[PDB]
Amino acid sequence: KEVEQNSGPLSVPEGAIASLNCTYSDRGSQSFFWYRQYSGKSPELIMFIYSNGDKEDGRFTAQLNKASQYISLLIRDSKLSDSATYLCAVRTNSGYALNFGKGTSLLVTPHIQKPDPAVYQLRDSKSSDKSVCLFTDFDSQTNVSQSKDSDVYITDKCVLDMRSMDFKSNSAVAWSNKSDFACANAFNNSIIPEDTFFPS
Amino acid sequence: GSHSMRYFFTSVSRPGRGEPRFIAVGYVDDTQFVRFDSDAASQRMEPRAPWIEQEGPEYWDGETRKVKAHSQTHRVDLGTLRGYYNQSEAGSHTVQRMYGCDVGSDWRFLRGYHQYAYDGKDYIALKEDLRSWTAADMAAQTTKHKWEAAHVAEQLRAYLEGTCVEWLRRYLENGKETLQRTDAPKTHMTHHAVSDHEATLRCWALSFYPAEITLTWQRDGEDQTQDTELVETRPAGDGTFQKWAAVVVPSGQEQRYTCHVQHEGLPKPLTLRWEP
Amino acid sequence: AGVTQSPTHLIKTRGQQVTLRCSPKQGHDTVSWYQQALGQGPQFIFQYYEEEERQRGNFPDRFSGHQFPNYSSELNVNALLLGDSALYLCASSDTVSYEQYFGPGTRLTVTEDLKNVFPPEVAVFEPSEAEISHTQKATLVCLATGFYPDHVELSWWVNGKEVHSGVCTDPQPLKEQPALNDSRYALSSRLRVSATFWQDPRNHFRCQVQFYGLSENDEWTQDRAKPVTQIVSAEAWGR
Amino acid sequence: IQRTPKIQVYSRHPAENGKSNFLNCYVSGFHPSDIEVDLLKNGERIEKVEHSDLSFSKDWSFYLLYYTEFTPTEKDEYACRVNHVTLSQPKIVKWDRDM
Amino acid sequence: SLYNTIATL
């Protein structure tokens, strides 16, 4: 493949400089673009660069270096809404097609002021034909693991902003239909904080 | 010394027709290497040198699609201009475009250029850096503002410094046997009596490459210039060039006159005299 | 005024044909088509200008295009393979800057057989009474499961109004049978509110999943309900 | 704007009566592009006349080369004829070994 | 080699 970039995810703390690269091989390469794509949406052009050097645009700086054949993009002052996949594309002088990278996924991590790691158990409103475990209020530096068990489903981490008392939280959910699953065992392939709260 | 890659494009509207005639040629120095003609059956960029035939079908497909884009771009421009000048459909009008690279003896970028003409007068052109445009008139001034918003110049500049140069550097290597050759002029002089006390001395330079050449007459060392007929340097047809310079002198004073030939090929300048 | 495309989603069976539409942005006249496989870069299919295929990528005969005299475009694919499942992006440009701008896409899922299509079952789990006493906050989770394909929009509604504060939804679904191409999918979301706001027994919570499924066109011979485009929701009441 | 042609008729390599060569008519300096150019072999037009691809100079004015295989004889008069919008009268230029 | 993104007036 022509244009190469790493899949990531890159993890960046909120407020801090994100940094993406992209290298290409064809020396015919003449014009360069960064597109941003949110989950389940189209790519949107966030920057074009045509000349060697830097180009700053608000929080975004792109850096092209044709001799070494890279284009970087730096996002200063990373916001949560910057979490997205960043694709880079080159157009060579031989034609009109854009040639794209895989995309690098960027997760911007929020800082939790008072972490309070806890695994809660939740019943279903109607039957008891599943039940669920909610690992929540852990700090952003905890990696949650997928399950070793074929019939136990564990979601990735995900961050909510209770905007009105401006509070952010990490959570992941685990569930099974199995006789012999419960919230004590659910996040055991994850490295849990270990003063984590476990109530009945 | 220096070398250049220069592309030339001509579109002429045919009101008694649909489509404009369109012609593109590519030179390296004084040597043409490609052409496209709308009226040639082909509908592709054709090679016109041995060292370009070397390129694969990837290359040719690209040059064909880009030349087609130029053709189509001139098509719409002919229309747009006709409208900017409130000119009827009955007239035949012309656009011309010239662009390319120069490099130094050290094959590094020296200079670039891109210029556009309408009916043989400058319309709009890149300045000597490649950041702004010279607009001839008020029509061109709207074209300028429009191209400024779209970063037309920046994209052009990236090609002229850069990829145009990289390609020139490549053609000079692959065609080294022809493009980096010099061929010194073969020379002679002819003496033909005009009238009864007066004779024409004509001094010839033939079979030289490149086309750059100086041909001067001197009288006792003083350089005739008002008194010399000098013809434009002309193609032989075999990838070499020709010039001559003539002067009319009083008969018996022929010994006082000498022709001076300066050319990249010659180690020291030649000096021809009228010798039987 | 922006680039438009349709349809936004599609399910086609293998070997059928499809025909996607794209209208460029007002003021643009060239359209390029691209295929985006999941977790991957858009691949150039071809570009159309002045009603002609100006340039083509690495896509075979069975992908044909058309551009009409208004500058809009059609991408027809026939002999669909499962491999053609992708986000089909259309991009427009002028001939001045040549900047390419993408539309929303058409999400094509090609299955071998339409009995692989399943809507979601949806469930809401009510916050733990431990969480409420320990943090003064209450997290409901929602769980949409057993659906195929991954064309869904999950939303939370409180007292009949859609909410965004306090929500987060897995940006990607989980596969239930990870080895299968036609595996079914699951997805969770959370809504988090103050314990006091949940403890109020007037307040009512609905988790909603929009599923994109079969059209009216499509033939259906199974006993189970035709898994058409539909919304499946689940709810909870406070205490 | 109109500018008037410049004509030069000459052989490719030095001429020799009764030896194989090419006869060139080189026309330059002109605008607009539209041009009639004929090589002649005794006043009547030569059939097999080829030409260069149209191009132009930094001043915008066009140039073409018209050429043909030929074999000069002492007797036979070769020449070039050129017509253009800038001229009331078509211009003939005889080929001469020492132009 | 010829330029790709030649602009209209």
Side-chain angles (χ1 to χ4, degrees), chain B residues 96-99 113-117 122 124-126, chain D residues 58 60:
Chain B
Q96 292 171 259
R97 191 192 286 289
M98 187 270 248
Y99 64 71
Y113 33 83
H114 174 285
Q115 306 151 180
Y116 203 73
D122 288 309
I124 194 166
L126 236 39
Chain D
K58 57 269 110 230
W60 301 114

Side-chain angles (χ1 to χ4, degrees), chain A residues 106-107 161:
Chain A
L106 183 65
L107 317 184
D161 185 342

Side-chain angles (χ1 to χ4, degrees), chain B residues 103-165:
Chain B
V103 303
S105 40
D106 83 302
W107 287 357
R108 193 68 229 87
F109 167 87
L110 219 81
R111 176 173 306 104
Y113 33 83
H114 174 285
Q115 306 151 180
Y116 203 73
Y118 188 47
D119 293 330
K121 292 308 288 287
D122 288 309
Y123 181 82
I124 194 166
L126 236 39
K127 296 211 187 171
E128 199 77 289
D129 63 78
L130 310 136
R131 262 76 169 198
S132 53
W133 306 93
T134 324
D137 65 333
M138 308 106 261
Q141 220 88 26
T142 93
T143 297
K144 177 154 93 192
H145 289 118
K146 196 205 154 73
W147 285 2
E148 283 174 3
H151 310 270
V152 171
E154 201 189 341
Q155 296 187 71
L156 251 175
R157 185 173 84 250
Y159 169 81
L160 295 167
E161 26 218 63
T163 112
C164 168
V165 173

Side-chain angles (χ1 to χ4, degrees), chain A residues 98-175:
Chain A
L98 260 23
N99 209 308
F100 278 91
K102 284 184 281 254
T104 307
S105 181
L106 183 65
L107 317 184
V108 177
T109 267
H111 171 59
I112 310 309
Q113 270 128 251
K114 269 64 190 309
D116 192 355
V119 186
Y120 305 101
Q121 127 87 275
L122 325 185
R123 315 223 118 298
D124 185 329
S125 198
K126 55 107 193 305
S127 205
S128 40
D129 263 303
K130 305 254 179 304
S131 60
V132 164
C133 310
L134 174 64
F135 184 27
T136 190
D137 293 325
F138 54 88
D139 78 354
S140 289
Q141 322 318 139
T142 288
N143 301 345
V144 169
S145 288
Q146 218 94 121
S147 177
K148 288 192 183 176
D149 205 70
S150 170
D151 209 337
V152 180
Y153 302 115
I154 305 180
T155 64
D156 217 321
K157 130 219 221 315
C158 174
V159 28
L160 65 74
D161 185 342
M162 284 197 54
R163 289 171 129 270
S164 179
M165 278 163 292
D166 56 18
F167 192 84
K168 309 161 163 86
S169 338
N170 294 298
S171 59
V173 181
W175 73 98

Side-chain angles (χ1 to χ4, degrees), chain B:
Chain B
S2 298
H3 295 276
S4 61
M5 189 184 71
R6 317 176 288 161
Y7 282 103
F8 298 97
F9 310 90
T10 313
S11 264
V12 185
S13 57
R14 309 219 69 256
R17 211 49 272 290
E19 298 300 302
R21 178 62 170 282
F22 171 82
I23 299 189
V25 195
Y27 289 78
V28 171
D29 307 337
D30 305 304
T31 296
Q32 148 178 161
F33 70 111
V34 283
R35 55 109 85 187
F36 179 87
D37 189 345
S38 69
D39 291 16
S42 188
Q43 249 54 76
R44 293 194 66 64
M45 203 89 162
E46 298 155 79
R48 297 292 146 184
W51 47 270
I52 211 66
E53 273 150 60
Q54 225 216 287
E55 302 293 318
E58 267 222 85
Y59 177 81
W60 290 111
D61 289 350
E63 302 321 287
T64 299
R65 88 178 111 248
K66 288 183 274 171
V67 81
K68 288 179 175 171
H70 281 64
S71 159
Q72 272 292 169
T73 283
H74 286 32
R75 196 202 90 81
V76 339
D77 290 352
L78 277 166
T80 312
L81 292 150
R82 186 162 78 76
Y84 286 165
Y85 292 108
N86 203 269
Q87 294 158 327
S88 86
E89 296 185 306
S92 178
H93 290 78
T94 307
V95 295
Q96 292 171 259
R97 191 192 286 289
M98 187 270 248
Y99 64 71
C101 284
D102 291 348
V103 303
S105 40
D106 83 302
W107 287 357
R108 193 68 229 87
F109 167 87
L110 219 81
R111 176 173 306 104
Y113 33 83
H114 174 285
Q115 306 151 180
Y116 203 73
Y118 188 47
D119 293 330
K121 292 308 288 287
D122 288 309
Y123 181 82
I124 194 166
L126 236 39
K127 296 211 187 171
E128 199 77 289
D129 63 78
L130 310 136
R131 262 76 169 198
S132 53
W133 306 93
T134 324
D137 65 333
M138 308 106 261
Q141 220 88 26
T142 93
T143 297
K144 177 154 93 192
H145 289 118
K146 196 205 154 73
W147 285 2
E148 283 174 3
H151 310 270
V152 171
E154 201 189 341
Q155 296 187 71
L156 251 175
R157 185 173 84 250
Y159 169 81
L160 295 167
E161 26 218 63
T163 112
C164 168
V165 173
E166 288 154 352
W167 277 107
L168 172 50
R169 267 201 291 272
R170 197 186 175 208
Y171 300 141
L172 290 168
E173 257 294 23
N174 302 153
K176 78 216 300 289
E177 305 292 325
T178 96
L179 300 175
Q180 304 192 239
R181 135 198 101 125
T182 63
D183 283 326
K186 296 189 203 82
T187 33
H188 68 288
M189 226 180 88
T190 60
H191 170 278
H192 287 146
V194 150
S195 63
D196 316 340
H197 289 310
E198 251 186 56
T200 296
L201 296 184
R202 184 175 294 109
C203 164
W204 284 82
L206 293 184
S207 307
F208 55 92
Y209 183 87
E212 178 80 326
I213 200 167
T214 303
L215 213 67
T216 322
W217 277 96
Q218 302 181 333
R219 174 194 81 237
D220 297 314
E222 105 87 280
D223 37 337
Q224 250 72 315
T225 253
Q226 218 79 144
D227 235 288
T228 298
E229 200 163 70
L230 187 72
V231 312
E232 266 185 310
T233 304
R234 72 211 201 196
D238 64 8
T240 75
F241 291 100
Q242 297 185 346
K243 208 186 196 58
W244 63 252
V247 56
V248 169
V249 309
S251 309
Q253 305 292 63
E254 286 93 343
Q255 70 290 347
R256 300 182 141 197
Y257 290 82
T258 99
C259 191
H260 285 252
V261 185
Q262 297 226 151
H263 183 67
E264 293 93 318
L266 296 160
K268 287 140 212 206
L270 292 163
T271 283
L272 294 51
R273 224 170 321 272
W274 173 236
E275 303 303 343

